[PDB]
């Protein structure tokens, strides 16, 4: 590669990521600062859409009941904290995931964050200094959620207004929409191939020629 390219939504704002914890709520168009499918330390480099937080009050006696075994194919982040210094055990049938008698009787919370990614235009993610666009040179990609390597060039593909990525006939990403609404196709990882050495046999000389297989 030859350079680094980054493109992030230009929206900037301070995020209520802190207010909600200490006091289902949606968070969007913010810049959070800061697990079942993601690593906590890796959360500040990916851009999601409309992260949701589920909040309710339950004592530590019930924290060990919230986990798959919550959908089974879904991910999220769970925090908990106790300080001491209602529920239903009767219902005809259970409930499908993410849908909604006695009293615990507290005497002296659980946040289930949900991440949605690569569906709508990116609106929720942390600090990332942007960069200018470079074309026709093997570079690195750091688009909203596409880290790779290749060569960029303007595209001639008629994207629908509700689409933001591209796909080939084999499910490879040969196109993208810049967060500034531009269709540039990232064709091929610049160049690669094989190397073959032609020698007369080292019993008559030590001079060799080199062939590069598939290159302009």
């Amino acid at each position: 590669p030859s350079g680094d390219v980054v493109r992030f939504p230009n929206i900037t704002n301070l995020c209520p990521f802190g207010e909600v914890f200490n006091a289902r709520k949606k968070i969007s168009n913010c810049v959070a600062d800061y697990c079942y499918g993601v690593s906590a330390t890796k959360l500040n480099d990916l851009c999601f859409s409309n992260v949701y937080a589920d909040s309710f009050v339950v004592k530590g006696d019930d924290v060990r009941q919230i986990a798959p075994g919550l959908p089974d194919d879904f991910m999220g982040c769970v925090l908990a904290w106790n300080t001491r210094n209602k529920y239903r055990y009767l219902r005809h049938g259970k409930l499908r995931p993410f849908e909604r008698l006695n009293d615990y009787g507290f005497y002296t919370r659980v946040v289930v964050l949900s991440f949605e990614l690569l569906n709508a235009p990116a609106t929720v993610c942390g600090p990332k200094l942007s960069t200018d666009l470079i074309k026709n040179q093997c570079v690195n990609f750091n688009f909203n959620g596409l880290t790779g390597t290749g060569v960029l060039t303007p595209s001639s593909k008629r994207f629908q207004p509700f689409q933001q990525f591209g796909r080939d006939v084999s499910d490879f990403t040969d196109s993208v929409r810049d967060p500034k609404t531009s269709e540039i196709l990232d064709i091929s990882p610049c160049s690669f191939g094989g190397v073959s050495v032609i020698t007369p046999g080292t019993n008559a000389s030590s001079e060799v020629a080199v062939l590069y297989q598939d290159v302009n």
Partner: peptide, 12 residues
């Protein structure tokens, strides 16, 4: 209806 928000061309 469109199953997802991905672009595709000349494919089944």
């Amino acid at each position: 209806y469109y199953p997802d928000e991905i672009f595709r061309s000349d494919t089944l």
